[PDB]
């Protein structure tokens, strides 16, 4: 099932790795006054090992 | 209120320059070179909306 | 390309049309004009002509200070050209209403 | 007219007979050439404006 | 009568009172604050403040 | 109210113009 | 994603002869996400292959020039239509035809002339006394503007990312207008 | 310049066909441009008599 | 009809019912393959037409 | 980080077409996003007078 999960953002990478560093670089500069952070999904994911 | 009009001939005139038959033939010969293409806009460019 | 085939940019006639003729047409204006027969594009200047900065082309100014004597009016304006901007003296006048 | 002239109100206009009005698509609106400024100024590229 | 659409004879321009023009159903176009009425051509007036 | 462009230039001896250069391979 | 890239598509422009700006293939794209790793990784196999050959194609077709979505093409890369030069025959001995004319005979009709054995021919040139310059014809942007591909997209410094993409960039000023 | 191979300066052609609707009529002409002439057409006209 | 018949206008048309109208795709109008020639000629393909 | 042009803060669009019903009300809308501007949908909301 992971490609479905890993495309939709379930599973997979932080918001911050999976998009461009251009995009990062300018969400991360203009935070105070336009905000693109609510606009993507990370995943979190439960331990299932140990 | 009455009017008409009747067309009883037309005809076509055509007027050329008399031009040497050499010169005429030269001139034809650049003419039909493909660069040497003549070309018209209408003086009023414009979509009549 | 379809502009430069139709002759609305590029080259003038005495460019594009073959050398031969253009000797020929200059040899023969006075007396069988060929210079009506072929298009010369005209193309305005697209840089450094025009700004596309948010910008008045007409200010109207109110008089900073009036006087209103018994035989002469007075008015002052504070004519300011701001940066960036040349103003021809020729584009003034005062506009009076009474 | 007269010392017995009656109280009056103005009324102004206009006519300009064989004319057309004319607004030019050009970045201001004196004719620099017949393929004006703004017809090629990133009207072009796709653009299909409304 | 005369055909104003073909033989040029206009005479109903002093009729119009203003214009505006938009691009993109947003965008007024001469825009850039370039007129005393930025917004639109306003031909001409009935009262003038 | 409109607009076109009509592309003449010129060039003469005070006598006229025969045309110029022969590219001529004759006979 | 960001290293099996969609290819950007070049938009043209047939007025000016040139690219148009630039977007992404989103009309050619097989949707597997009702399929499982054992096909994805076809797919996968699929996409990456394709990028292959846009990139081989890119290096043998393309002009190598510094700037993708150049304003101005020198007469040199430009394709031109240069035809051979154009001969005619003369259809009259002109000083013949003015020494039996003043003579008193008419000469009417027409070639042939049976009273000089003179013809005449002269070779033209057909060409455009310029070379031309400027846009590129159709059949050249094909050769050209080959599909992009473009890895680890928007990651290296903001002012060398590729600009003429987008399709209101005014390349001769790297600055953006409005509708005036 | 000139030709002095007998020639015409004008030429007077007449309508090969004619349609004479109630409303709008045609003509059609052959215009013949012999070898050796050319036609500037601004010298053509159609001569009208009714 | 008859000898006493009525002058007349004609009137011309066409019915097409159970139809949908086709224009196909391909550079002379005919089917050669399911995917047609203009559909390959990679004009109409690669760098993308609006 | 603020463009030097006139342009709009808030825009107001009227329905292209409407369908008031028994029960029910439709609108439509083009919203119209012009050129080198985003949308936040956050900031767009349904102006109601009744």
Request: glycine content about 6%.
């Amino acid at each position: 099932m992971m490609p479905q999960w890993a495309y939709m953002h379930i599973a997979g990478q932080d918001a911050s790795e999976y998009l461009s560093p251009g995009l990062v670089q300018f969400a991360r500069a203009t935070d105070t006054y336009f905000s693109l952070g609510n606009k993507f999904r990370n995943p979190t994911v439960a331990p299932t090992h140990d | 209120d009455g009017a008409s009009v009747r067309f009883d001939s037309v005809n076509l005139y055509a007027t050329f320059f008399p031009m040497a038959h050499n010169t005429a033939s030269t001139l034809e010969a650049m003419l039909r070179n493909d660069t040497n293409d003549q070309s018209f806009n209408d003086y009023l460019s414009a979509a009549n909306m | 390309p379809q502009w430069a085939y139709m002759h609305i940019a590029g080259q003038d006639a005495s460019e594009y049309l073959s050398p031969g003729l253009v000797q020929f047409a200059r040899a023969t204006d006075t007396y069988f004009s060929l210079g009506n027969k072929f298009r010369n594009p005209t193309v305005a200047p697209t840089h450094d002509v025009t700004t596309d900065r948010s910008q008045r082309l007409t200010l109207r100014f109110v008089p900073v200070d009036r006087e209103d004597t018994t035989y002469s009016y007075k008015a002052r304006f504070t004519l300011a050209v701001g940066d960036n901007r040349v103003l021809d003296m020729a584009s003034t006048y005062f506009d009076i209403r009474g | 007219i007269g010392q017995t002239a009656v109280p009056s109100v103005t009324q102004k206009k206009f006519l300009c007979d064989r004319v057309m009005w004319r607004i030019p698509f050009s970045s201001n609106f004196m004719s620099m050439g017949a393929l004006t400024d703004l017809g090629q100024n990133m009207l072009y590229a796709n653009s299909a404006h409304a | 009568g005369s055909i104003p659409y073909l033989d040029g004879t206009f005479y109903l321009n002093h009729t119009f009172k203003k214009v505006s023009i938009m691009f993109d159903s947003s965008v007024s176009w001469p825009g850039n604050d370039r007129l005393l009425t930025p917004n639109e051509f306003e031909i001409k007036r009935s009262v003038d403040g | 109210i409109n607009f076109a462009s009509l592309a003449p230039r010129h060039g003469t001896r005070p006598f006229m113009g025969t045309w110029n250069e022969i590219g001529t391979s004759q006979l | 994603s960001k290293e099996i890239p969609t290819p950007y598509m070049w938009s043209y422009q047939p007025q000016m002869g040139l690219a148009a700006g630039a977007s992404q293939d989103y009309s050619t794209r097989m949707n597997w996400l009702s399929a499982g790793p054992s096909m994805i990784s076809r797919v996968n196999g699929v996409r990456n292959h394709r990028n292959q050959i846009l990139l081989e194609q890119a290096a043998v077709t393309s002009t190598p020039r510094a700037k993708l979505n150049p304003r101005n093409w020198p007469s040199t890369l430009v394709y031109q239509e240069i035809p051979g030069p154009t001969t005619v025959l003369l259809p009259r001995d002109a000083l013949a035809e003015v020494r039996m004319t003043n003579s008193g005979v008419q000469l009417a009709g027409g070639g042939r002339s049976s009273f000089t054995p003179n013809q005449a021919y002269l070779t033209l040139q057909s060409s455009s006394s310029e070379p031309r310059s400027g846009g590129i014809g159709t059949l050249q942007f094909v050769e050209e503007f080959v599909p992009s591909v473009y890895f680890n997209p928007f990651s290296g410094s903001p002012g060398l990312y590729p600009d003429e993409f987008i399709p209101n960039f005014d390349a001769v000023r790297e600055a953006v207008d409005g509708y005036d």
